[PDB]
Design a binder for this molecule. Sequence first.
Ligand SMILES: Nc1ncnc2c1ncn2[C@@H]1O[C@@H]2COP(=O)(O)O[C@H]3[C@@H](O)[C@H](n4cnc5c(N)ncnc54)O[C@@H]3COP(=O)(O)O[C@H]2[C@H]1O
Lengths: 155, 162
Amino acid sequence: GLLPSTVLAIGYYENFVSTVCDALHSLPTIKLNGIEYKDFVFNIIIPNDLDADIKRRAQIYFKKMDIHEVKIDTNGRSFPLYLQIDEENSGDVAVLYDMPTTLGGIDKAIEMYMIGKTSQQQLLEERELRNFKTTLINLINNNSFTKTFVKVIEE
Amino acid sequence: GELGLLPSTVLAIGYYENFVSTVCDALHSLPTIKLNGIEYKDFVFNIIIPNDLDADIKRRAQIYFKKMDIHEVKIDTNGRSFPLYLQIDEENSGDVAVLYDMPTTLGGIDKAIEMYMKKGHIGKTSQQQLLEERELRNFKTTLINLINNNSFTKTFVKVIEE
Ligand SMILES: Nc1ncnc2c1ncn2[C@@H]1O[C@@H]2COP(=O)(O)O[C@H]3[C@@H](O)[C@H](n4cnc5c(N)ncnc54)O[C@@H]3COP(=O)(O)O[C@H]2[C@H]1O
């Protein structure tokens, strides 16, 4: 019984999480926005609901938390990926953030196969956010190039 | 019935919302479209939908781009949210830039169905390959309906076969 949240989590893991960790794992020395790091953590922000659109929401979170854009050029044919870095207090570890824009799909999808967000629809979009977070945590913990390097957190 | 919203439906929406209309919006915005230094008078954006999920999507796409002699191109330029990487036919594009992409999102259906299979087999079962089949068809139908229901994509994006 495949939940959409489950496919989306796997899509985001294979095509974004792994791709980013690999890019950073392939640099002899990690150098982000021209400062050298000895290690990294990659924080996946799960939103608490789908009331605000994810791109709008993420932008608010990153401004609020004063963390700024950084492009990581992938070690494949030079394709930079987009994410946010918290460059604070001369830390050795590069503390990176993303909020999965793929979650947008769930809001639009739910609101398209249904005015006012019913507690029934709220409990449905709640269930998907948790299923996505749970799948994602499982996938991360199941590969040595992602485990210890990736954190799934709440907004 | 509990919402029978297929995964392929949500993935097709996400691809449309966060990629197809992001690309069109970047090209519609350009006073003149300039790709790898070339001016184009308009564009068409072709979404290659794979016939199956036998081959991994990125392996597949490489094969299609290489067999079509299509080339890498960077769009959205700079300081426009984030840059995008596409494939263009520099050989047969005149006034119209012909752009390609194979949805990498389709890659999540394979690995998902492969996870949820309750046993290991040499290759794949007929039933397994039936689910893949009908999920790719739903994605194409969902994308074609999304594309056609908007001025900003309707003439500009086309779903093609591998
Ligand atoms: N370059 C990138 N920049 C930022 N986040 C990235 C990313 N590549 C992947 N992700 C994240 O991973 C999700 C799944 O990516 P996937 O490649 O499987 O599926 C993607 C992919 O097929 C396409 N797409 C989106 N952004 C793309 C990009 N910059 N280049 C190429 N394809 C992109 O649209 C699908 C849905 O994207 P969506 O945002 O809904 O959801 C994306 C997004 O949340």
